[PDB]
RNA sequence: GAACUGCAUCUGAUACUGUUGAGCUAGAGUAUGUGAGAGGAAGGUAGAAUUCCAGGUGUAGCGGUGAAAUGCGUAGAGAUCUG
């Protein structure tokens, strides 16, 4: 159906969410570490994101996609490893860019932890 | 005898303090030219980001932790796009 498309690699300290869009931003399909059968510590690995990026990304190959520009967005561990199962899944990368959220000093942030 | 540091009244001295006349610029200020600054007060506006509301895609998780659980989610969340 369609042929270019956009992989978002939002990823975060605990979960990593690896969906996987159209050009203009329609969902495909999507994949995440913890409904990869990963908890807890083992779901904030570089190697559950390489599962679920793996399984999100061959769930929407039926669709046509062959052509597409990941996005990620996150400090987790997960933004390194994802684009590296794209690349080996046969997937031709358009671009590599980071669109993350960086304030210009607005909101306050919550309160650090006394751990 | 000495001392009683004292008090008073005269006389003298004029270095210093006091009071005064005149003068000086070195302390302190004034006028004029440039300069830097998140100095203060009143208005206006810009861009990120969060939250919320409404839609499109989409499906089983999201969130969180050292682990969990409370919580949110099949009444459609989270993610993604547009307002």
């Not at 956009?6 to 999507?30: E, P, Y």
Request: net charge positive; proline share 5%.
């Amino acid at each position: 159906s369609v042929s270019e498309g956009i992989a978002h690699i939002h990823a975060s300290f605990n979960n990593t969410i690896v969906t996987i869009t159209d050009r203009q931003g329609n969902a495909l399909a999507w994949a995440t570490s913890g409904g990869q059968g990963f908890r807890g510590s083992r779901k904030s690995t570089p190697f559950a994101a390489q599962v679920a990026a793996e399984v999100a990304g061959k769930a929407a190959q039926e669709y046509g996609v062959k052509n597409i520009d990941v996005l990620v967005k996150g400090p987790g561990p997960g933004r390194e490893s994802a684009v590296r199962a794209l690349g080996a899944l046969g997937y031709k990368v358009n671009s590599i860019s980071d669109v993350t959220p960086i304030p210009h000093n607005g909101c306050r942030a919550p309160k650090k932890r006394r751990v």
